[PDB]
Ligand binder design. Sequence first.
Ligand SMILES: Nc1nc(=O)c2ncn(CC(COCP(=O)(O)O)COCP(=O)(O)O)c2[nH]1
Ligand SMILES: Nc1nc(=O)c2ncn(CC(COCP(=O)(O)O)COCP(=O)(O)O)c2[nH]1
Ligand SMILES: Nc1nc(=O)c2ncn(CC(COCP(=O)(O)O)COCP(=O)(O)O)c2[nH]1
Ligand SMILES: Nc1nc(=O)c2ncn(CC(COCP(=O)(O)O)COCP(=O)(O)O)c2[nH]1
Ligand SMILES: [Mg+2]
Ligand SMILES: [Mg+2]
Ligand SMILES: [Mg+2]
Ligand SMILES: [Mg+2]
Ligand SMILES: [Mg+2]
Ligand SMILES: [Mg+2]
Ligand SMILES: [Mg+2]
Ligand SMILES: [Mg+2]
Lengths: 203, 198, 205, 204
Amino acid sequence: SPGVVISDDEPGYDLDLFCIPNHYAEDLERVFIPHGLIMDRTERLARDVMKEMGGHHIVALCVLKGGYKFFADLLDYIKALNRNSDRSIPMTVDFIRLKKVIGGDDLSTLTGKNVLIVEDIIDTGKTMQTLLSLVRQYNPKMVKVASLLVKRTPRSVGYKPDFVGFEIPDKFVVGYALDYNEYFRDLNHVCVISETGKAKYKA
Amino acid sequence: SPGVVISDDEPGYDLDLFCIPNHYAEDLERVFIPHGLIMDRTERLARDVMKEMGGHHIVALCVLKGGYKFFADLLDYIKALNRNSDRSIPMTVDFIRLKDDLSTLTGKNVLIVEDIIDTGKTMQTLLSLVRQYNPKMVKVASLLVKRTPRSVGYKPDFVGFEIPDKFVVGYALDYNEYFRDLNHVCVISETGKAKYKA
Amino acid sequence: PGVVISDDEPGYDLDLFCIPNHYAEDLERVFIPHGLIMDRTERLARDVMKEMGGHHIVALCVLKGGYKFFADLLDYIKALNRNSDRSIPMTVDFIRLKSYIKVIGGDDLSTLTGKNVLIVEDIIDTGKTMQTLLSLVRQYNPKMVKVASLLVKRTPRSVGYKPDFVGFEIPDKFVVGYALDYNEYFRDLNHVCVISETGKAKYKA
Amino acid sequence: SPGVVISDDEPGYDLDLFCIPNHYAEDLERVFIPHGLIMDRTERLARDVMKEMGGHHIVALCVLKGGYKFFADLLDYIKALNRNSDRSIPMTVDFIRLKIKVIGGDDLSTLTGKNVLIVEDIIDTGKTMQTLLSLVRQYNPKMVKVASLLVKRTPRSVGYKPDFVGFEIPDKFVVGYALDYNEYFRDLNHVCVISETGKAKYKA
Ligand SMILES: Nc1nc(=O)c2ncn(CC(COCP(=O)(O)O)COCP(=O)(O)O)c2[nH]1
Ligand SMILES: Nc1nc(=O)c2ncn(CC(COCP(=O)(O)O)COCP(=O)(O)O)c2[nH]1
Ligand SMILES: Nc1nc(=O)c2ncn(CC(COCP(=O)(O)O)COCP(=O)(O)O)c2[nH]1
Ligand SMILES: Nc1nc(=O)c2ncn(CC(COCP(=O)(O)O)COCP(=O)(O)O)c2[nH]1
Ligand SMILES: [Mg+2]
Ligand SMILES: [Mg+2]
Ligand SMILES: [Mg+2]
Ligand SMILES: [Mg+2]
Ligand SMILES: [Mg+2]
Ligand SMILES: [Mg+2]
Ligand SMILES: [Mg+2]
Ligand SMILES: [Mg+2]
């Protein structure tokens, strides 16, 4: 699937309809993807991953920092399947940050393994493209990419992940570990920043 | 607020994008309100209830059968506030079914919890029965309120979602007792209406 | 197999957990943490589906005490149903028990005929009540009848009835919380707990 | 608080009482600390953290890899606290791996003037935290506190005691809830003890 498609004209939700940290009350325009909706979509994603990679060991690779929540929740849903079914995905985990791969184990530890890369968002797709080329050089058995969000943009290089949560309009989103200058990671909903939020936390 | 307003032209979601029970695969048309969205909205409602009833004992009254999931979940979010704040709503619980002695409501603060209000006629009827026992105060929370010209004009104190006049199931709402065991609120398909018809 | 809680189980200091402010002086110890109940319930759900998953299930909640266990147990069953190949519809009903045993507020028990009936209870103590309800239910020729009880007490007062599915086997001590009450109080408490002497006097009828 | 004290002769739980990953059925001996108990304790820890640290911008530092589950859950509870009142403070997050060499984080200067919460899976000898602390303090945080899910009772202790402690456990080797044995057992919700067969099967 292209994932859950959010139209260009979608108005999102009034902030007053949800519980939102008071320190961000004036910094956000609307709620765009409620936390619980992300969870519902992530549950179905876990099952799709189980379908595609079930019955083989997986190395789950989290692209920090923005991927951390999606990673934890996706792995939690996969673990729920592992313990309530007879078929399993034994998993190990690693974490990288992109500058240039920062931290993480030797990429040679990926050689001959089934790798699931977990990302928060694909915009141009250039970054994931570059990451994939690099990882491929270490001869993994298989590599798939799960991304919570994919942006509809004319700047799109044309990269499509294997698993996508939501396909969104070309708007700058924050929340659910996605940040603006390190802020808004502590917000469980995906939201659009307000003009005052951009000005307040501007680098 | 009127709650989360869902438009007449809301398309809903393709079933294929969510986890749904196999035995209903052919019987639903779209998912209308995702379980998680319901939880998010319910978390805010619990804070609204606390703001309005916060300093007092309440009797939480569940209207069975459809109100059972919303009731459990709303009370769970209230309890979360009760144990993480110095503000507290002590609660007792009661159940009733429409289609304990209400005397126990005399002089009490009562929160009635309902799955859905359509015409409002059922709730007005329930309210007139409760008021016969002279409660101290009565507030009503409904997960769903229908936008419909058939409404008698009754509006609840707390509303989750305001929806189009469409027949919905799931999250404990049924069609002939079926579809209660569905976490999402959904719109039933033609084959489902026929399969499960009385 | 039930989790066995020993006679000498000391439980946990209240200050190690989050508990409702209005009950701070009213409880003695946390006996069974909420999280633990959830973990055990997850596994009970699976046991239930393994045994009953083969035919339409009617889940009967015994109010009021059964309501929390019922909701959570059904949530775990639903999670199973939506992440698996095969699935069966479940319908639900709710009943209260009253001595003249008399069943209040359910559907016609003829709805039970030919069905896999799952009765969901908070606690079995002497078990006289469940033993009576079962005899009743069996008049309507259910395909199958099984009982799930969050708690079962080790008590010399037992008539010898044991449920099919048990969360925890506990000592002969009065417990409250997770919808179990003392004079209607303590239902709004997530953990299973023991009441303090001040709690007993405050809420005594 | 010393946290929830688990005795030397605590027997933990038979695996059959819980749902356990199919692939570890032979590799564990007992469940030691059920996932749910960890969550209940973590919720209370979150409240204690906000009570001490909630007055100023908090930077939460996750010590990878084993601290990742405790970190995600602890922060979720903290976020829940911050959205159910009108009083809250911003929190930012960082992730480090420990080699006195800190791998993969932001410049430590980003800690200057902040309330820093270091989140760890377990303290044993305590040598790692003490060394980490000695470094972090040289960046003049407004305050530095450490939350650790587990703290071991051991005569090998350097005498370090964290500020927030989930559980105080015996000197036993445990896995689960992101704690590993040679990278295995991270994908397990409960804290458990390995079996003899598990230890030989996954030995490095
Ligand atoms: N937080 C956020 N929200 C967006 O809507 C958004 N749209 C694009 N991007 C850039 C994204 C990812 O886009 C990268 P690419 O165009 O796919 O190569 C975050 O990148 C990491 P940073 O070094 O800026 O912190 C976004 N980041
Ligand atoms: N399941 C369901 N879905 C609806 O969209 C819907 N819209 C209205 N109604 C009737 C609703 C509530 O509307 C009642 P009212 O017109 O406000 O008095 C509840 O169903 C109770 P019953 O028919 O099982 O006895 C609905 N019921
Ligand atoms: N709340 C509670 N805690 C107990 O430890 C306990 N042990 C036994 N019981 C009596 C319980 C359960 O045991 C009944 P039985 O002896 O198995 O028929 C009934 O609760 C109904 P009521 O008291 O609101 O009328 C208990 N009730
Ligand atoms: N998984 C695990 N279980 C334990 O019971 C346990 N007890 C101590 N340790 C070592 C712990 C604690 O060591 C830090 P310190 O002794 O407090 O200075 C960290 O393990 C990291 P690594 O060996 O993968 O590099 C443990 N690790
Ligand atoms: Mg990213
Ligand atoms: Mg960024
Ligand atoms: Mg109703
Ligand atoms: Mg109905
Ligand atoms: Mg009972
Ligand atoms: Mg009672
Ligand atoms: Mg560590
Ligand atoms: Mg390790």
